[PDB]
Amino acid sequence: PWRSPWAISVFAFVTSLLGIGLLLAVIHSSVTRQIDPKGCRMSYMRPSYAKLSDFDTEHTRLASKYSLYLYREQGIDHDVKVRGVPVLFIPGNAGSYKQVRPIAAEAANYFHDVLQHDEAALRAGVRSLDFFTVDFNEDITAFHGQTLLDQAEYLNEAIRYILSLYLDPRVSERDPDLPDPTSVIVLGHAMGGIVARTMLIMPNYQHNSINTIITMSAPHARPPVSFDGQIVQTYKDINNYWRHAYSQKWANDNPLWHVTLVSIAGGGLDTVVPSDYASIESLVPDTHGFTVFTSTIPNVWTSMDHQAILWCDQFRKVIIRALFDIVDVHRASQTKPRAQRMRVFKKWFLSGMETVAEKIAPTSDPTTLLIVDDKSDSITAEGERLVLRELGTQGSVRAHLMPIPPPGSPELKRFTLLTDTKLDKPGENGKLEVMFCSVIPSQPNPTGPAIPSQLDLSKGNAGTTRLACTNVAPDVITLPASTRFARFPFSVRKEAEIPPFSYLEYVLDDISEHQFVAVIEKATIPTPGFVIAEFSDHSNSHHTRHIGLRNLLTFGISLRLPSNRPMMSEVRIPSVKSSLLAYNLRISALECSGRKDLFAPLVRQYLAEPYESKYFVNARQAAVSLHGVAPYVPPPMSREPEAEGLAFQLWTDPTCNSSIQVDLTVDVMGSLGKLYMRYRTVFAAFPLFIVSLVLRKQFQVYDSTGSFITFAEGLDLSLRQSIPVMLIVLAALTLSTNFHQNDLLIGTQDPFFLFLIPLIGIICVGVCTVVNYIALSLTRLISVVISFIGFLTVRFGTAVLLFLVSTMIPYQLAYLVACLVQLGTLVRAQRISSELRSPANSNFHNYVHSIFILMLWILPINLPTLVVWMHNLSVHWLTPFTSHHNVFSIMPFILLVETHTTGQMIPRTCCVLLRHITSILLLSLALYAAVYGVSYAYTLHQFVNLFAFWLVMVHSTADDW
Amino acid sequence: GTTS
Ligand SMILES: *NCCOP(=O)(O)OC[C@H]1O[C@H](O[C@@H]2[C@@H](OC[C@H]3O[C@H](O[C@H]4[C@H](O)[C@@H](N)[C@@H](O[C@@H]5[C@@H](O)[C@H](O)[C@@H](O)[C@@H](O)[C@H]5OP(=O)(O)OC[C@@H](COCCCCCCCCCCCCCCCCCC)OC(=O)CCC/C=C\C/C=C\C/C=C\C/C=C\CCCCC)O[C@@H]4CO)[C@@H](OP(=O)(O)OCCN)[C@@H](O)[C@@H]3O)O[C@H](CO)[C@@H](O)[C@@H]2O)[C@@H](O[C@H]2O[C@H](CO)[C@@H](O)[C@H](O)[C@@H]2O)[C@@H](O)[C@@H]1O
Ligand SMILES: CC(C)CCC[C@@H](C)[C@H]1CC[C@H]2[C@@H]3CC=C4C[C@@H](O)CC[C@]4(C)[C@H]3CC[C@]12C
Ligand SMILES: CC(C)CCC[C@@H](C)[C@H]1CC[C@H]2[C@@H]3CC=C4C[C@@H](O)CC[C@]4(C)[C@H]3CC[C@]12C
Ligand SMILES: CCCCCCCCCCCCCCCC(=O)O
């Protein structure tokens, strides 16, 4: 019986409704649930660009297509001359060379305002930053690999030109004693970070010409999409190059020995590039680089868009300060040595509470000698917190000396100090100064001249004990100000910014050589300010909750920290690692009896795996979203059991004498919406798993009964047996020194996330049903247009295609034209089937429609190459095409579409062997799309091309062509 | 002038 193409089973309709429903729930809860606060303040400047038009086609063939600019900030840069350190900014996929405005303007203003007057800094080798930016015509690099290689080659030539600029007296004004620059600092945004890394493997790379790469939101670990095979191959090349180079034992064999790469990720607000891909932990050892999120950068403490990471005011200030602390024009490479650069980058980008953090004060030179009476009024008893609720109560400079406990005890102990008042630098007068003091023996034992050592005498008597003291300002940890009037670690308005807190954390072994911690209260009149300092035991401050993921998701975890707890407490849940699960954290009200608390509770939600810490000021209710073990990224390196999972660091006022409760439960809808970033690219390949299984059932029934069923009927028959079985096979496949372990299927071999395979399968079933109905609607709409033209008329009245592809037409244009001709054939077939309603006309219509659906699900992969080609034609760039690849990638589709235009139905199918070949081919296509589809989506075109060729063979000689 |  004739069954309409529009009819659908209740089973297949309900399943498609759930698939579309689960798609809307994932999409909706990815834009509304667990969204980080936006805290970027807009930056304003006066942009200007000088085109370096002497860098032309004589230097590189790409100079007819690309351009190089020198950023000039009006009012500060009054001429086009280079006078400092060259910096190169590389924009991303369809980015602009004008996106260098904020970072280049901050650098121009900061040197004008501050540094050019700083004579010591100029004596140390600091100069202007010359910001060069490159115009790529908004070329789409992520979707084309030859574009990426062209950009890298152009930029190597551009670096040669830039370094030649500093040799010309008519273009460069510099001190004559300075060395000639031999390196450029590269700042790359998005795919620009990849061009920056690609630049070091290209054959025209000049050695030692790059040593500093900073990338903002660049997908280092993994290509964003795999629609082009050249992108995937270039990623393999650069990732292999880093891994092989840094795996060398001898530095002379390491080409990247002097290169530092710092990867900054926007975080959860970045919806263009997943922040999971920014992790370079599998590429760069910690001695040469790290991955940092903008939420952990001090004085930034916010997540950012892909585009906001460039123009954020707080972030641009920090990056410019870091760039100005590494430059050294006394060295031909215009930067400090690699270790010093790493130390500076850690200081400016990291929280300072990391394991890789370096403590300077414990083992540095003393900067003051403190003379204090022997009455020991200043010297307090061990085991007492020092709490200063106001500064300047007495009216004179005071010293509070806290004796450091002896190291005899076996358990680990820490000294922690928190204050809201800025700590004085050495040789400075302010409200407060903290310093590590060591007793100077009364015996005149010779030592350093102590000429830098200033002297503070607070003894005023004959006692006069002498202390040599080191200021601890080098190692101050900046914490967001947590007061009762604060809601976010940041402030979008500069006027409303609260000056941040100051925090010191030391292990007892680091400072055991000293005898005291001196908190020098220099204020005389009573001024607002608090200081809390104490020594605490690791047992009392650090709590670990060993709870499985199943129990955590079922019940949650709840803690009760006691009242007699330190200022800083840590709660670690080692079983919270996944980036796909989001939680809700609740901190109970601090019932401070009588007195108000010195400060509101501060929570630091942090991970050690990348450097991602998130701060919650005045914490009661926090959304816990972490970038941990992501699906398709290389596996995490080895770490100690004390640094696995998620940890919460808590600061509360310890004088309140009130216990605090910490609850952590799972956010189901937020966890569901976490899947959009991780699995959006599954939907260029995985719907082909469903389509191939439906076309397999359609051909099975045809070869057995001679009736070629509709796509909806094939879907109904496949959902009953074929699709569920092959999802079980995918699950079984997942359960069965390599950095590509995580490229296949769902990205993870973890058993907990096996439900993702049914989830993706059902969403793809819904998407395939919707696309089927869209194609049916489009066919009917074009048929209505044709019939309307016919009625308006009535009432008011070959074999050349091979030559085209070999010469100039990329096979993607031919594929689009083939899809259009197939749509025309589909319209003709539907019209004929409606007119005659024969069982033979229904077969041809259904067959042509299914082949059209198969062709249509490959078009997403081919479309990006058309926009690149059209763009290149607009720019007048011509790219030759290898005829062997073009012809063989399009001829089976051309022949199939021609055969369909002849109106010939596929011959019904040693004969059983030909019957089984179609089944095996479609099964292999389904399995291949499911398994290798995310990482190797460019191979699907070739595999579907092979299937189109077999169908041409069954058509020809399996019948009369 | 000034732009953003
Ligand atoms: N002052 C200082 C500075 O400032 P400014 O700048 O002003 O800023 C501020 C601002 O901002 C904003 O605005 C902005 C601006 O702009 C300006 C600019 O401009 C330019 O630039 C630009 C460029 O050009 C562009 N291009 C861009 O770029 C970028 C770059 O940069 C980067 O690098 C890269 O990466 C990228 O991103 C790029 O972009 P592109 O590429 O273009 O894009 C990409 C993206 C998008 O795309 C789209 C896509 C396509 C579509 C399609 C899709 C697909 C579809 C689906 C399917 C359908 C089909 C159907 C079927 C049927 C058939 C049958 C038959 O991408 C993305 O996004 C990705 C994602 C999405 C996609 C996809 C997805 C899909 C799918 C999926 C599904 C499913 C899955 C799920 C689930 C599953 C799972 C579960 C289970 C398991 O951008 C830039 C910007 O920056 C330049 O200029 P010039 O050049 O001159 O001009 C030219 C023009 N073009 C520069 O210079 C400037 O600056 O303004 C404007 C106006 O005019 C606007 O628009 C913009 O936006 C605003 O605000 C804002 O801001 C920021 C942004 O920016 C943020 O952050 C904040 O928040 C705010 O909102 C304003 O207001 C302001 O004022
Ligand atoms: C979740 C998926 C199914 C989204 C697609 C929904 C729309 C496009 C589909 C779902 C069910 C479909 C209907 C199912 C059955 C028939 C009867 C047939 O004689 C004419 C078309 C008609 C009336 C279909 C029109 C299109 C339809 C309403
Ligand atoms: C059967 C259906 C799904 C076919 C339609 C899918 C097509 C229209 C979509 C799917 C993914 C899309 C691409 C995704 C993103 C970009 C980046 C942008 O800078 C240029 C356009 C480009 C390259 C899109 C072109 C159109 C595209 C290829
Ligand atoms: C139905 C087909 C949907 C397929 C989903 C494709 C998702 C496209 C993702 C865009 C990749 C990022 C674009 C450039 C970003 C960059 O510069 O790194």
Automatic annotation (TrEMBL), chain A:
State the UniProt keywords alphabetically.
Endoplasmic reticulum, Hydrolase, Membrane, Protein transport, Transmembrane, Transmembrane helix, Transport
Residue ranges of domain GPI inositol-deacylase PGAP1-like alpha/beta in the record: 82-325
Task: List the cysteine pairs that form cystine.
Answer: 40-312, 437-469, 592-656
**Tagged with keyword Ligase:** no
Name the Gene Ontology biological process terms: endoplasmic reticulum to Golgi vesicle-mediated transport; GPI anchor metabolic process; protein transport
Where is this protein localized, as stated in its record? Endoplasmic reticulum membrane
Stated EC number for the protein is 3.1.-.-
Recorded hits in Gene3D superfamilies, A to Z, give: alpha/beta hydrolase
The principal localisation class reads: endoplasmic reticulum
Q: Where is the GPI inositol-deacylase transmembrane domain?
A: 682-955
Where is it found, in Gene Ontology cellular component terms?
Answer: endoplasmic reticulum membrane
Q: Which family does it belong to?
A: Belongs to the GPI inositol-deacylase family.
| Function per UniProt | Involved in inositol deacylation of GPI-anchored proteins which plays important roles in the quality control and ER-associated degradation of GPI-anchored proteins.
This one is known as GPI inositol-deacylase
